[PDB]
Design a protein. Sequence first.
Length: 396
Amino acid sequence: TTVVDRWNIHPDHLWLRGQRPESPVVFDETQGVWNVYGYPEAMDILNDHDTFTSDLAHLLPVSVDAPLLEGDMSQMDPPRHRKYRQLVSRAFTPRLVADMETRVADITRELLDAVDGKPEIEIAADLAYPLPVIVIAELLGVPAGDRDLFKKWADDIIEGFSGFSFLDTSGQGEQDVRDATERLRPLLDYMAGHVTERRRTPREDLLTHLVQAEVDGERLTDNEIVNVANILLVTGHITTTMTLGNTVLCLDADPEVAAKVRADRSLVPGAIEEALRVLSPSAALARGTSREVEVAGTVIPKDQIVMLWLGAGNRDPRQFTDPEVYDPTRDPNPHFGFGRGIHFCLGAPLARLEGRVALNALFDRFPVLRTDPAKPPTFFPTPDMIGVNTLHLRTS
Ligand code: HEM
């Protein structure tokens, strides 16, 4: 019995149980998008960014009244995206992430210290959710003493810098984004002050590296840097906590694999990777056709919206043997969890670091963790995001 069937996870998604359409590409008419379920097809689509573009503004109906989030690279197309990515990736580096490990462990310990010994913890509220927030804030020059100032802004930040948002958008939803954005002057004055400081007295940190990022002299403006930082405050945050909770849920569902993983911590990252393939926080990606293109015998007209169901592609039997089986030992595990191509997830090594550190400490602190049917795991309502929003676990 899989983790999906145990908790009746997203019953709307049949591919979560191996029920797949015969064709990889199936046009909807609802819902006027082209759904892609196949692994080789998704790979082809993701690699061909020219044919399958990422800026969908011209493709959205006037019913979609969405505020454009400044600096959002995922909604951005080349050549501008290329320059923006070259620059941001000059700063957001593997070395900077790796150097954060001790800090991540220290934050993780403090969080676990608060609930150590309790007969029941809730994984999201106690660990999975606060950790990515604090970690990314410190990377952006937010000192500990200013945590109360950021929990204060917590709600407004995420409404104001979440972004789009095709499947889940509503009129009232976008309305909320606008209102939050109207109350963000003091956050953007906050970031601007730290950017001005890093340009004045440079440090070995992210904000400074964003200021100094070069590529033949062509740099980011202070305003673009502030926008990059504010976006980073929320991008990957929710998905990171989902990923943390999803891994534990997959492990709970199979006590023998859980025991094996606890015994052999070298399997932790693999268990995290496998959870991303099994329960995808980013289940759906949107692309726009720039021309008429044939994908697997299916002709897609120009200016059509393609929905890449990465969760389904992650279960394509052509690519994955026993696709419905959570197996942390899969090596390699070329899932679509972080995407593929010029838009490949930038925060992936940070996500993987927080995951490995948090998981190992959780197992260390709590030798026994089991779900409660009286307090069942809940899930995000969204169709494009497959992750837990709450976990209740027994110390037992
Ligand atoms: C488990 C956690 C995460 C998952 C599952 C995830 C998922 C993804 C996916 C699927 C994409 C590709 C989007 C596309 O092709 O349109 C992406 C891109 C991106 N990610 Fe993540 N993400 C995670 C964490 C993070 C974190 C922690 C950060 C930064 C602190 C981050 C920053 C970004 C940015 C800036 C992009 C856009 C890159 C571009 O468009 O060139 N992500 N993410």
